[PDB]
Amino acid sequence: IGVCYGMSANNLPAASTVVSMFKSNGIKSMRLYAPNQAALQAVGGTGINVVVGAPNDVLSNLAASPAAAASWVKSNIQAYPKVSFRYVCVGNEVAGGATRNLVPAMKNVHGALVAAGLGHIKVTTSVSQAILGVFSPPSAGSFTGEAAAFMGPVVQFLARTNAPLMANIYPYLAWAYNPSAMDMGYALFNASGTVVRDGAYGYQNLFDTTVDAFYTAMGKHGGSSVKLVVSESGWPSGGGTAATPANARFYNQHLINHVGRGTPRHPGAIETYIFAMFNENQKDSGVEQNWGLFYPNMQHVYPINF
Amino acid sequence: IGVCYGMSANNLPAASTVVSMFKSNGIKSMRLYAPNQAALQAVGGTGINVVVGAPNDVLSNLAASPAAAASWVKSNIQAYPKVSFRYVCVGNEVAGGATRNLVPAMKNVHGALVAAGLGHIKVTTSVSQAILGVFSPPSAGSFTGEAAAFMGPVVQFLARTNAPLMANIYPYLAWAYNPSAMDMGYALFNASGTVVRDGAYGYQNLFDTTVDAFYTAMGKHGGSSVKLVVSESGWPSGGGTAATPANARFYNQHLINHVGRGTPRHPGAIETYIFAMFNENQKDSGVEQNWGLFYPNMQHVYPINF
Numbered sequence: 043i044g045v046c047y048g049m050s051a052n053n054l055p056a057a058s059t060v061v062s063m064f065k066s067n068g069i070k071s072m073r074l075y076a077p078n079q080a081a082l083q084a085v086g087g088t089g090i091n092v093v094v095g096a097p098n099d100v101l102s103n104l105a106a107s108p109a110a111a112a113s114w115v116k117s118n119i120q121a122y123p124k125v126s127f128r129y130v131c132v133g134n135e136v137a138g139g140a141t142r143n144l145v146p147a148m149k150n151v152h153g154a155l156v157a158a159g160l161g162h163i164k165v166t167t168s169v170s171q172a173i174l175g176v177f178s179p180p181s182a183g184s185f186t187g188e189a190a191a192f193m194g195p196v197v198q199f200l201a202r203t204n205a206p207l208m209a210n211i212y213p214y215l216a217w218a219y220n221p222s223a224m225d226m227g228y229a230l231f232n233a234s235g236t237v238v239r240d241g242a243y244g245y246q247n248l249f250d251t252t253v254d255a256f257y258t259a260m261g262k263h264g265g266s267s268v269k270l271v272v273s274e275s276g277w278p279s280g281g282g283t284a285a286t287p288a289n290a291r292f293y294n295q296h297l298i299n300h301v302g303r304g305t306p307r308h309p310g311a312i313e314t315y316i317f318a319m320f321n322e323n324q325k326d327s328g329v330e331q332n333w334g335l336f337y338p339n340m341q342h343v344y345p346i347n348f
Numbered sequence: 349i350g351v352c353y354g355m356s357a358n359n360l361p362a363a364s365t366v367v368s369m370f371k372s373n374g375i376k377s378m379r380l381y382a383p384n385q386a387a388l389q390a391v392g393g394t395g396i397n398v399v400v401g402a403p404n405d406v407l408s409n410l411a412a413s414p415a416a417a418a419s420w421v422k423s424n425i426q427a428y429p430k431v432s433f434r435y436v437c438v439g440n441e442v443a444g445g446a447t448r449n450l451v452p453a454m455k456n457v458h459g460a461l462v463a464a465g466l467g468h469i470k471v472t473t474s475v476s477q478a479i480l481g482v483f484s485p486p487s488a489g490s491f492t493g494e495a496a497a498f499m500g501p502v503v504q505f506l507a508r509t510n511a512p513l514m515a516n517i518y519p520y521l522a523w524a525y526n527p528s529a530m531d532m533g534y535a536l537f538n539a540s541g542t543v544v545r546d547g548a549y550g551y552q553n554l555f556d557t558t559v560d561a562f563y564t565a566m567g568k569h570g571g572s573s574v575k576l577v578v579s580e581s582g583w584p585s586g587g588g589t590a591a592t593p594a595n596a597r598f599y600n601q602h603l604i605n606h607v608g609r610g611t612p613r614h615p616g617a618i619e620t621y622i623f624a625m626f627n628e629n630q631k632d633s634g635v636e637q638n639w640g641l642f643y644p645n646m647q648h649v650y651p652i653n654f
């Protein structure tokens with residue numbers, strides 16, 4: 043399992059301490075939202091797989107100038123030969139007109155990587171579950187109209203480069219939108235006795251439903267060979283309805299034990315990253331400040347066996 | 349929210365006055381059942397979105413001749429450059445053998461719109477909730493055998509053109525059909541909790557159930573990417589059981605406050621049109637003459653905030 047190393051806080055431990063926590067807890071992969079020099083210098087030579095992101099504010103530059111892309115790769119990838127880079131995630135939940143820069147930026151970063159002999163590092167992007175117009179039933183999975191406009195080209199690029207699509211999937215957020223619309227147990231991996239039939243397949247949790255819905259949506263744009271990586275998933279420990287340490291532990295521990303089995307339509311391990319390592323005090327007040335597995339003081343918010 | 353501007357009456361205010369009422373009340377969209385000249389002249393330059401219909405009696409002509417369709421578009425659409433046209437609704441609850449002319453007519457109108465540089469105006473059709481063979485539970489939603497025959501091609505045409513399907517949904521009529529079959533509160537938006545449990549999903553009102561049933565039916569015909577627009581919905585203020593100003597206000601005010609959040613399986617705003625602006629004295633005696641938000645003299649039948 044992997045863990046997202048969010049840094050929107052002013053009281054987190056230093057990078058080398060965090061890298062050490064990953065190692066002592068058995069966390070194999072780390073997702074960074076930007077090429078933080080401290081984190082990259084510290085994670086090198088530790089064996090931890092790294093997903094490094096190109097933040098949304100640099101997308102325009104990477105799309106507009108392939109030279110800028112080669113420079114980005116040189117300064118943030120080639121500069122750290124000891125780091126086990128796995129993917130370069132270009133953008134995170136890019137929206138609006140900025141989506142037009144997505145494919146061009148990915149193409150330019152991809153070209154720069156291959157040229158440096160670093161072509162084993164796959165280029166992808168991370169999308170929100172909100173781009174799904176239909177998630178239930180999974181067999182009818184489709185992207186919304188707006189999303190379909192840019193997702194078509196994105197999915198086709200991933201298919202031709204043999205790169206996976208990254209998706210931030212949060213059963214908690216789908217449920218919290220309207221608590222009366224579905225049983226909480228369905229979103230929490232606690233829906234005993236509940237089997238929602240979709241043709242020949244039976245679903246027991248919202249995570250599987252959403253993952254399979256994404257796969258169906260991708261298949262409609264020529265992406266039947268594209269794998270899905272869950273780049274974010276978690277449950278808040280406070281700040282909102284059902285956001286408690288007990289529910290967060292239940293969700294995350296069940297998630298960890300579940301991803302190796304896969305979904306009804308897609309058996310097999312699903313690469314997953316839990317959001318997030320620490321509670322981040324500089325995010326919005328409410329659930330947003332309570333997504334951490336650890337408190338800034340390094341104490342577990344709740345027990346977890348990775 | 350939008351409002352249907354029905355004209356089956358002999359004592360309604362002039363079109364320019366009606367348009368003034370739309371503005372002063374905050375009604376953003378208007379549905380016309382025919383390209384009424386007085387109305388189209390009066391609504392131009394107001395910003396009010398317009399759904400214009402091609403009445404059932406002109407369907408065979410539009411289907412048989414591309415030239416007739418181009419002429420219809422020229423006289424009723426191109427002739428009003430100041431009108432904010434949103435959709436062209438070809439037919440309203442077309443039934444029997446006339447349904448064979450549906451797709452041909454839509455194709456011809458669509459072709460004419462594109463050639464004129466008005467391809468942004470989507471072509472659709474409006475169907476009755478009566479074409480649903482099963483509406484409960486929503487996961488089992490499906491069209492009647494007869495409806496399925498023509499709905500397949502209709503939904504497929506809509507999917508290919510990125511146009512929505514319009515549906516006239518009336519919880520009142522479904523309930524009034526057999527009052528013992530369901531609690532009136534369920535139809536009126538006054539149920540306390542979950543009335544229908546569908547797998548992990550909970551429905552507390554008939555409106556949501558019907559909308560989701562339509563989505564399921566469409567998905568079964570290749571229309572999982574097709575959005576639904578509620579082209580009509582309301583509650584009568586007199587002329588029948590439970591038809592009172594208090595119940596009509598309750599239903600309509602709750603609908604207005606509800607549609608922005610969507611349904612259990614389709615969260616998000618649902619484009620909705622309330623039937624209707626005025627009570628229409630040339631309709632059948634009973635509930636049919638009491639669907640209005642306003643009396644012909646322009647007084648509110650009941651207080652409403654849009």
Ligand SMILES: *[C@@H]1O[C@H](CO)[C@@H](O[C@@H]2O[C@H](CO)[C@@H](O)[C@H](O)[C@H]2NC(C)=O)[C@H](O)[C@H]1NC(C)=O
Pocket residue numbers: 227230232288289292
């Ligand atoms: C997982 O689901 C079970 C079964 O619904 C939950 O256990 C019930 O919890 C309620 C709490 O009010 C009790 O009244 C019931 O008696 C419990 N059922 C049984 C069989 O003991 C359990 O709380 C859920 N777990 C989590 C973490 O939400």
Ligand SMILES: *[C@@H]1O[C@H](CO)[C@@H](O[C@@H]2O[C@H](CO)[C@@H](O)[C@H](O)[C@H]2NC(C)=O)[C@H](O)[C@H]1NC(C)=O
Pocket residue numbers: 533536538594595598
């Ligand atoms: C909406 O539902 C409420 C609650 O069921 C109705 O109010 C109750 O009506 C009964 C009459 O049978 C009274 O005895 C209760 O005291 C009322 N409860 C409350 C809290 O007021 C209400 O009448 C319904 N509204 C509509 C328009 O049907």
